[PDB]
Ligand binder design. Structure first.
Ligand SMILES: *[C@@H]1O[C@H](CO)[C@@H](O[C@@H]2O[C@H](CO)[C@@H](O[C@@H]3O[C@H](CO)[C@@H](O)[C@H](O[C@H]4O[C@H](CO)[C@@H](O)[C@H](O)[C@@H]4O[C@@H]4O[C@H](CO)[C@@H](O)[C@H](O)[C@H]4NC(C)=O)[C@@H]3O)[C@H](O)[C@H]2NC(C)=O)[C@H](O)[C@H]1NC(C)=O
Ligand SMILES: *[C@@H]1O[C@H](CO[C@@H]2O[C@@H](C)[C@@H](O)[C@@H](O)[C@@H]2O)[C@@H](O[C@@H]2O[C@H](CO)[C@@H](O[C@@H]3O[C@H](CO)[C@@H](O)[C@H](O)[C@@H]3O)[C@H](O)[C@H]2NC(C)=O)[C@H](O)[C@H]1NC(C)=O
Lengths: 53, 439, 48
């Protein structure tokens, strides 16, 4: 059994998603484009953090 | 009746096709890809798993010298050390003060945890595609599942469907694949018998039950510490655990075109690459003669609102006069506008409402209902919500069906510049004609 | 939610409490009686 992180707080902007993240433990956040070039990126979040994608 | 169509490989977006048999009421079929599964053919080369170093007890021979015979074990080494004086809990091992020898031998074999903890290296050659399809056939929702190689035909409601082959051969797998449990990695693993110490593939075997083990771990024995009977050794730690601690992101999270990856069997699911042909055979019994189906005349179209959002933001109302009550297919005559409804119920003189989506600033299109065409025109406004969670239901605008109704600025500027150019060319022609006539 | 001011009140003794903590109830796990939820942590603590 592994836990599920809290729901991030999501806001929107012109071709932007702004996510506020509240991890209890170091949580892996990754994202990729779903086109020809995924441009996969990942990072470990240890504390509350705001990410603009 | 045989009908040939092509639909994009996008999953979860329905597409509508028009089965048009002249002399019969046209039909509209809505097909949606629930899943496209690519299952490649895999040939196993070897499996890599944690090794264990089997070290028998040391052989302490005093007033004597031990020798070891070279054995053919996967990675086997003997060393005899001289001048050892081992101690037990009680005292010195034996009377013999010097010239004592200790033979220490060690080899490497697959740990029994290889039965469960292992990573397989496969070769991927070709992919056999399959597809699950939801079809709106004569107002009924039917689900089919069939191979997408263009070879398998599936029959539902006496209608035959041939799906594929997919127009693109792209697959997220390259030639060499590593499968651990459920994570597929795209890695150039070393060939069998060529593994290197401290990396992936240090210990290999053709099959999980094969006794043939290729081990390359730089296993070197070292002299035991004075007054101790232990067997020290210098060995590169297991390459499988090393690979596990730095696996990186598997293909499930980095595959292009948003492919999902599954294992047992290895599948690539919902890859939105290329498109997919579909051939449809419909019985002549399913068709209906035009004289029986309702016919619509005195038909006009008006759009109260249009919003070129990813959802169906546009609404059109069509005034019609129906000869008889019944169902009728509705289809778009342009590729830039997608109609949500597939069939409407019509009776008498009334009006009907349809929902549509588009990307055009100025939506100018035509709608066919019971072989009657109506030209709809509207000005569409952009939405206020920047981001949505669903793919666009409309197709993208290209290079021909472009611009808005306020393209008349382009026409005006082109006409003005062309008029200036025409005036200049006319003046030049007049002058040249005068000069040529004059001599 | 999750920032300074997620829960507010006019005075410490007032019973008028405004709260925007993005509290979403989740499905309990099979075979258990717990009440799971996904709630943005206290913005006051994060500010502290
Ligand atoms: C914990 O859970 C894991 C996974 O859930 C279990 O591992 C599974 O163990 C099974 C038992 O061995 C594996 O099943 C078979 O294992 C064979 C071992 O030799 C393996 O060779 C088999 O694979 C062949 O057959 C498949 C049939 O579809 C083929 O797709 C595949 O490519 C293989 O084909 C062979 O290819 C070579 C290459 O030339 C040929 O020479 C052979 O003739 C081909 N054989 C056949 C039959 O065509 C088969 O998988 C199972 O694979 C394995 N799981 C995984 C993911 O690999 C653990 O056992 C479990 N733990 C415990 C304690 O039970
Ligand atoms: C034929 O199927 C389509 C697609 O729906 C799929 O098939 C159905 C049988 C169900 O298994 C669905 O879960 C599945 O995805 C049907 O279109 C969809 O119908 C559903 C309900 O009929 C619509 O859901 C509703 O949507 C409204 C508006 O958001 C909500 O308020 C409701 O609470 C409900 O969720 C869905 O929007 C609709 N989708 C589209 C693209 O039209 C279709 O109705 C069905 N037809 C027949 C005759 O069975």
């Amino acid at each position: 059994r592994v836990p599920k992180a809290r729901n991030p707080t999501v806001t929107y902007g012109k071709n932007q998603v702004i996510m506020l993240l509240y991890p209890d433990h170091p949580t892996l956040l990754s994202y990729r484009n779903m086109g020809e070039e995924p441009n996969y990126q990942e990072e470990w979040v240890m504390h509350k953090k705001e990410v603009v994608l | 009746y045989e009908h040939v169509t092509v639909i994009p490989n996008t999953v979860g977006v329905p597409y509508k096709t028009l089965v048009n048999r002249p002399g019969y009421s046209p039909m509209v079929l809505e097909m949606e890809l629930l899943s496209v599964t690519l299952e490649p053919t895999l040939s196993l080369d070897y499996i890599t798993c944690e090794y264990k170093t089997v070290i028998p007890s040391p052989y302490v021979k005093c007033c004597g010298t031990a020798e070891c015979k070279d054995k053919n074990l996967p990675d086997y080494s003997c060393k005899v050390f001289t001048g050892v004086y081992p101690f037990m809990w009680g005292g010195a091992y034996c009377f013999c003060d010097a010239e004592n020898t200790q033979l220490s031998e060690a080899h490497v074999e697959k740990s029994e945890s290889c039965k469960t903890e292992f990573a397989s290296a496969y070769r991927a050659h070709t992919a056999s595609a399959s597809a699950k399809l939801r079809v709106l056939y004569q107002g009924n929702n039917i689900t089919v599942t069939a191979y997408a190689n263009g070879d398998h035909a599936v029959t539902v409601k006496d209608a035959k469907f041939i799906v594929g082959p997919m127009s693109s051969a792209w697959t997220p797998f390259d030639n060499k694949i590593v499968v651990y449990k459920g994570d597929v990695y795209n890695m150039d693993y070393p060939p069998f018998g060529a593994g290197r110490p401290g990396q992936f593939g240090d210990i290999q075997s053709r099959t999980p039950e094969s006794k043939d083990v290729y081990a390359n771990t730089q296993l070197v024995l070292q002299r035991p510490a004075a007054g101790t009977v232990h067997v020290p050794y210098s060995q590169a730690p297991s390459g499988f655990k090393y690979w596990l601690k730095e696996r990186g992101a598997s293909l499930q999270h980095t595959a292009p075109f948003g492919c999902q990856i599954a294992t047992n069997p290895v599948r690539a699911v919902n890859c939105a690459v290329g498109n997919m042909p579909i051939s449809i055979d419909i019985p002549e019994a399913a068709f209906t003669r035009v004289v029986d189906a309702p016919s619509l005349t005195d038909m006009s179209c008006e759009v109260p609102a249009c919003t070129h959002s990813s959802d169906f933001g546009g609404v059109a109302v069509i005034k019609y006069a129906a000869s008889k009550k019944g169902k009728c297919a509705v289809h778009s005559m342009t590729n830039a506008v997608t109609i949500r409804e597939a069939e409407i119920e019509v009776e008498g003189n009334s009006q009907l409402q349809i929902s549509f989506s588009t990307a055009l600033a100025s939506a100018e299109f035509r709608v066919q209902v019971c072989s009657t065409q109506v030209h709809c025109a509207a000005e569409c406004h952009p939405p206020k919500d920047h981001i949505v969670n669903y793919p666009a239901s409309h197709t993208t605008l290209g290079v021909q069906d472009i611009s808005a109704t306020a393209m008349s600025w382009v026409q005006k500027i082109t006409g003005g510049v062309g008029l200036v150019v025409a005036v200049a060319a006319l003046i030049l022609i007049v002058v040249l004609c005068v000069s040529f006539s004059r001599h």
